[PDB]
Amino acid sequence: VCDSTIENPCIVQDSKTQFSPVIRYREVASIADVYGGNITGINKFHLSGSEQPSEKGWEAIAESISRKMKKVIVLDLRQESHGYLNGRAITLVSVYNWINLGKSNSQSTLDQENWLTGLRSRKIVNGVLTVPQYVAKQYSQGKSMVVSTVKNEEYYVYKKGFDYYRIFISDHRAPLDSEVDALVALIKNNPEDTWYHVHSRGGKGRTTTVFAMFDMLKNADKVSFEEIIARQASIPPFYNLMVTNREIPELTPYYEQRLQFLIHFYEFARQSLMGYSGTWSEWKKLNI
């Protein structure tokens, strides 16, 4: 039985079933129809986001993207190990969902796939908790499930003809410099018409952070910091990156640091649109 430590992490089932719908799907361009302030540079984005989809959720997302259309890149923002059991999204959860905190991206991927390979070799997976059970610390009341399939996200992304690219952001936290560099390079290294579907575990904090980063990279020289953050918060689920006191108070330092990073990324983006040609890591060394 798990105990949410890194030594005995929990299998937590994020999808209620393999048919569960996507509840936090949205397209950034819709901000132009809801936000009452500066909407300059919004309505042309090829950018959607969501929480972690179920098997069926990927179908709905693919259909949504096709209706709004080039290349489609699914942007997985999750550092933590995750995958699918019988079409249901699952996560390997330690306290604050930081199972892979402090690891190289190579080790994070290795640990995830070693875990998924282990589950895949079993006929029965025990100790599968729902999110309510995990929150309630009912570590021994998990269910035993006959294994039909165990898959990583790539399996479902590849099946839709999309690319998969992972940015290893720790839950509740700002991206590390390596991952900022990687995101900026990805955007620069792909056509401007590329569609990105950004997702995290909950489609809230990390997803909205990256939405804001996209917005700044394109518009920081014609839209104020406050309006970029505000307009990103204007569409459901209305995630406001200005808020640093949230449901879990022990996480406030990380929300404050994440907003502080966004302040600096905004200036980096603005100066980049004005002539600066280096990377985020190079700019940060000279300016912070």
Ligand X SMILES: O=P(O)(O)O[C@H]1[C@H](OP(=O)(O)O)[C@@H](OP(=O)(O)O)[C@H](OP(=O)(O)O)[C@@H](OP(=O)(O)O)[C@H]1OP(=O)(O)O
Give residues 244-273 in contact with its own copies (rule: CB under 8 A).
Answer: none
Contact call for residue 88 and ligand X (CB under 6 A): no
If residue 178 lies in a helix (H) or strand (E), which one and from where to where?
A: helix 177-188
x-or-dash string of contact with its own copies, 27-46, rule CB under 8 A: -----xxx-x----------
Q: Which of residues 107-166 bind ligand X (CB under 6 A)?
A: 131
Q: Which two tokens stand for residue 250?
A: 């022990």
For residue 215, the partner it binds in its own copies, ligand X, none, with Cβ less than 5 to 8 A by kind, is none
Nearest by Cα to 99 from 88, 112, 89: 112
In the set 152, 208, 209, 272, which binds its own copies (CB under 8 A)?
A: 152
Report the side by side order of strands in the sheet with 150-151: 143-146, 124-130, 10-13, 88-93, 82-85, 150-151
Sign of the Cα torsion 251, 255, 256, 260 reads positive
Q: Which does 206 bind (CB under 5 to 8 A by kind): ligand X, its own copies, none?
A: ligand X
Distance CA 214, CA 10 (A): 33
Candidate residues 153, 171, 179, 215; the one interacting with ligand X per rule CB under 6 A: 171
Residue 167 contacts residue 210 (beta carbons within 8 Å): yes
| Residues at the contact surface with its own copies, assessed by CB under 8 A | 21, 32-34, 36, 67-68, 104, 106, 113, 116-117, 152, 154-155, 158, 163, 185, 189, 236, 238
| Residues at the contact surface with ligand X, assessed by CB under 6 A | 51, 97, 131, 171-172, 200-207, 246-247
